[PDB]
Design a binder for these strands. Sequence first.
DNA 1: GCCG
DNA 2: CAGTAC
DNA 3: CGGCAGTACTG
Length: 314
Amino acid sequence: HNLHITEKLEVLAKAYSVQGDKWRALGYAKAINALKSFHKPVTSYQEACSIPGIGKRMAEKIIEILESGHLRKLDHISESVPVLELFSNIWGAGTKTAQMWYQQGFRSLEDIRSQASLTTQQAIGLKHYSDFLERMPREEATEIEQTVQKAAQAFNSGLLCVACGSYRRGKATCGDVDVLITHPDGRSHRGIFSRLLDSLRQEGFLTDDLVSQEENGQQQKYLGVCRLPGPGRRHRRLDIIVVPYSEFACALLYFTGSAHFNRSMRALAKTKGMSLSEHALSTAVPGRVLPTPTEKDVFRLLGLPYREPAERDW
DNA sequence: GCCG
DNA sequence: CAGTAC
DNA sequence: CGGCAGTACTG
Ligand SMILES: Nc1nc2c([nH]c(=O)n2[C@H]2C[C@H](O)[C@@H](COP(=O)(O)OP(=O)(O)OP(=O)(O)O)O2)c(=O)[nH]1
Ligand SMILES: [Mg+2]
Ligand SMILES: [Mg+2]
């Protein structure tokens, strides 16, 4: 858990990421993970090369940081990167939009606010800019889960509500709250976004909607914004997903993450003639859905030993 | 960027 | 669809 | 050479 190479490599990874070089940024992210969980400090080029996730090129960069104290490429990062990061930290704006605003001459959030064309989602990101960069204490994520759960349960007592994401992975702070709802009755989950969201609105808890297709009877997710009542409260991102019970174990696995963990698990299923999504684990193609009543069944069918959510925190 |  | 998001 | 996870809204 100790390295001084990763500090330098993260700056590069983030730069490629905000410039839209998503594959290169992915190679970096994994290299960093490998470096992060190596016992020893890495000392030989030979030793770097030996690691999975670390190729010829990553090894040369490591040998440079060791040999000298620096990575020369860090001196040549595009001058646009800090601005592109500023702009892609607006919820609903990504690298393409950031790059366009840059090309148009914008350089600050004041330029965005006064001159840029914003989508509805972006106007909401912008207005909650600081809040959405903050992580909340896990105790607050608890209160948010409980607000959602009380609202759901009032409608139907048998509804099951579990906070997922970082919260379920045991983290002390959380970027937002992700709540998964199902019903062991196989049926009653259907159509409730109507009732649940209307309830949470009546209380004034939800302050804005980001993604909510409420014209569709088969809406899967709500992504939006909430604020607990009373003084000293900030706006928080809230994600709610409602899933049939047969999909509960796959939904829980998915929504718990981490994102890297899921990508890795899916890559791996794929090497075994299988396919893993938030809905199911299947044979590959028309494939067959396999029965997965618990997360442990997903692990077992992939030939892997179970991992507690706290150990998925890649 | 990494890997098969 | 492209972009963005989980 | 070429995948790199698989899927859900928006406009
Ligand atoms: N953010 C993100 N989440 C993903 C992706 N793919 C994916 O399956 N997920 C799942 C795994 C995440 O743990 C889950 C919830 O997303 P999230 O952004 O709220 O993630 P989180 O709770 O783990 O982290 P955080 O909010 O505390 O920052 O959605 C992805 O590419 N990005
Ligand atoms: Mg953004
Ligand atoms: Mg989260």
